[PDB]
């Protein structure tokens, strides 16, 4: 009867079910109405759309395949550890992750010219894509952009889900140093290195981690009592509940290191940090292989999507690593890992024009040193946890 408990502990981190349902309209399935909508909409598009332009036909077909795969996801895909604001949103996020996985699998079979032609079809303008000792006080605040906003809030979310100053500060410092080193390696016109080791570590990353940890401690201490949207008498309370419907209903108490932790625990945390830094390398290298612009919708959309699938992945990884009755890895964690490895394989396959013969050796030495430093600081964290 331990197998029943095992399957329950997997079903609670893979497809979490909603508790205390009051407005039952949001949760009753209407799959036949969805089928009628699908058929009538595809009928309207087939019989009324003008399909004389073939490129537009291919683009609309791709968009519609994506839309209806998200519908299939809402129907049949797993939900994850999250049931807020609605499980269907997380099913659609899982479907997007599966689509991206299959996109990378396809990309691994084309050659460099075919992948470049694909990227040039998605963005026709991709073909033509390309003084620090006087750092004034105001050119410093000029550094803060919308992407600095993104860094801040991404680190806030990461520190919220990880619940550790040590892990977050380790990954922050190590990745900022790695990025500076690679920018020195590539030509990059890489002057002004005081905007990566100071403004990016101490203000964006540091403040983001601080905010994430404060909000995480708040969410841990608070007590969750959710009254129905119906029973609220006033209107301010009603809109307050409708807004809180987009917040966590309960919060997990995260502890990566036990008092006396096994070798499996340490190895799992080390693997976690290695895959974290690997997903950090994937973005840098994919943006440098093909000359991607940071303002294009796919560029920041892919980063937002990775940050979105990172939230269930961290919860499922923590559950599998620590919970003893969770005998299976969540499917979102599986897809996150396979994407994070396929992107590295893509970077290695199409990334032979980045460095010379000696610069690749420099990259390998730095990656070995980074892995060793990660292990050293993880061991230091475990020692401090055991003795203090």
Ligand X SMILES: CCCCCCCC/C=C/CCCCCCCC(=O)O[C@H](COC(=O)CCCCCCCCCCCCCCC)COP(=O)([O-])OCC[N+](C)(C)C
Ligand Y SMILES: CCCCCCCC/C=C\CCCCCCCC(=O)O[C@H](COC(=O)CCCCCCCCCCCCCCC)COP(=O)(O)OCCN
CA 242 to chain centre: 26
Fill in the DSSP letter of residue 80: B
Q: Which of residues 263-302 bind a copy of itself (CB under 8 A)?
A: none
Q: Are 316 and 94 in contact (CB under 8 A)?
A: no
CB atoms within 10 A of CB 43: 10
Q: Is 105 in the site for ligand P5S (CB under 6 A)?
A: no
State yes or no: residue 119 binds ligand A1AIT (CB under 6 A).
yes
Site string for a copy of itself, 83-122 (x = CB under 8 A): -----------x---x--xx--xxxxxxx-xx--------
210 is an interface residue for ligand Y by CB under 6 A: no
Of 201 and 329, CB closest to a copy of itself: 329
Q: Which of 183, 185, 208 is nearest to 361 (CA)?
A: 185
Contact indicator for 81, 16 with CB cutoff of 8 Å: yes
116, interface contact from ligand P5S, a copy of itself, ligand X, none, CB < 5-8 Å by kind: none
Binding to ligand P5S, residues 252-281 (CB under 6 A): 252
- How far apart are alpha carbons 313 and 311 in whole angstroms? 5
Q: Is 81 in the site for ligand P5S (CB under 6 A)?
A: yes
CB contact at 8 A, 172 and 210: no
90 lies in the binding site for ligand A1AIS (CB under 6 A): no
Q: Report if residue 299 touches ligand P5S, rule: CB under 6 A.
A: no
Q: Helices marked H in the chain — which ranges? A: 2-14, 31-48, 54-76, 87-107, 112-122, 137-141, 146-162, 165-185, 206-221, 235-244, 263-289, 297-322, 331-349, 357-387
The 129-158 contact track toward ligand X, x by CB under 6 A, reads -----------------------------x
Task: Count other Cβ atoms within 10 Å, centred on residue 178.
Answer: 19
77 binds, among ligand A1AIT, ligand A1AIS, ligand Y, none (CB under 5 to 8 A by kind): ligand A1AIS
**With contact defined as beta carbons under 8 Å apart, do 183 and 190 qualify?**
yes
Q: Does 368 bind ligand X (CB under 6 A)?
A: yes
Q: Is 32 in the site for ligand X (CB under 6 A)?
A: yes
Say if CB 305 and CB 100 are below 8 A apart. Answer: yes
25 binds a copy of itself per the rule CB under 8 A: no
Q: Does 242 bind ligand P5S (CB under 6 A)?
A: yes
Residues 297 and 123: beta-carbon distance below 8 Å: no
Residue 279 to residue 337: CA distance in whole angstroms: 9
Q: What is the DSSP letter of 276?
A: H
Distance CA(124)–CA(129), nearest Å, equals 10
Q: List contacts with ligand A1AIS (CB under 6 A).
A: 15, 26-31, 33-34, 37, 74-77, 88
Q: List contacts with ligand P5S (CB under 6 A).
A: 18-23, 26, 81-86, 88-89, 93, 157, 160-161, 226, 228-229, 241-242, 245-252, 301, 304-305, 307-308, 311
Q: List contacts with a copy of itself (CB under 8 A).
A: 29, 31-32, 35, 38-39, 42-43, 45-47, 49, 51-52, 54, 57-58, 60-62, 64-65, 68-69, 72, 75-78, 94, 98, 101-102, 105-111, 113-114, 328-329, 331, 334-335, 337-338, 341-342, 345-346, 348-349
């Amino acid at each position: 009867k331990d197998d029943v408990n095992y399957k329950m502990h997997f079903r609670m981190i893979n497809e979490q079910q909603v508790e205390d349902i009051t407005i039952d309209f949001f949760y009753r399935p209407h799959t036949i109405t969805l089928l009628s909508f699908t058929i009538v909409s595809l009928m309207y598009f087939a019989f009324t759309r003008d399909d004389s332009v073939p490129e537009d036909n291919i683009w609309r077909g791709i968009l519609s395949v994506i839309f209806f795969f998200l519908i299939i996801s809402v129907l049949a895909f797993p939900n994850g550890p999250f049931t807020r604001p609605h499980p269907a949103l997380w099913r659609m996020v899982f479907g997007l992750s599966v689509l991206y996985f299959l996109f990378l699998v396809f990309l691994l079979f084309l050659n460099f010219e075919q992948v470049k032609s694909l990227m040039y079809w998605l963005d026709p303008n991709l073909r033509y894509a390309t003084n620090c000792h006087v750092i004034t006080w105001e050119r410093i605040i000029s550094h803060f952009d919308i992407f600095a906003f993104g860094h801040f809030w991404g680190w806030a979310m990461k520190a919220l889900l990880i619940r550790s100053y040590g892990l977050c500060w380790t990954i922050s410092i190590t990745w900022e140093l790695t990025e500076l080193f690679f920018m020195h390696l590539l030509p990059n016109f890489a002057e002004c290195w005081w905007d990566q080791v100071i403004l990016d570590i101490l203000l964006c990353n540091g403040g983001g981690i601080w905010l994430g940890m404060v909000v995480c401690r708040f969410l841990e201490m608070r007590t969750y009592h959710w009254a129905s949207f119906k029973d609220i008498h006033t209107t301010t309370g009603k809109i307050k509940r409708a807004v809180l419907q987009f917040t966590p209903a309960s919060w997990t108490y995260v502890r990566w290191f036990d008092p006396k932790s096994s070798f499996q625990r340490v190895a799992g945390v080390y693997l976690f940090m290695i895959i974290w830094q690997l997903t950090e390398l994937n973005t840098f290298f994919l943006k440098h292989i093909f000359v991607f612009q940071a303002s294009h919708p796919l560029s920041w959309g892919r980063i937002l999507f990775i940050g979105g699938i990172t939230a269930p992945t961290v919860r499922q990884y923590y559950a599998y690593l620590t919970d003893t009755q969770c005998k299976r890895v969540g499917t979102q964690c599986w897809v996150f890992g396979v994407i994070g490895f396929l992107e590295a394989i893509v970077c290695i396959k199409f990334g032979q024009d980045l460095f010379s013969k000696t610069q690749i050796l420099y990259v390998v030495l730095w990656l070995l040193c980074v892995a060793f430093t990660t292990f050293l600081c993880l061991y230091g964290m475990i020692w401090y946890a055991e003795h203090y």
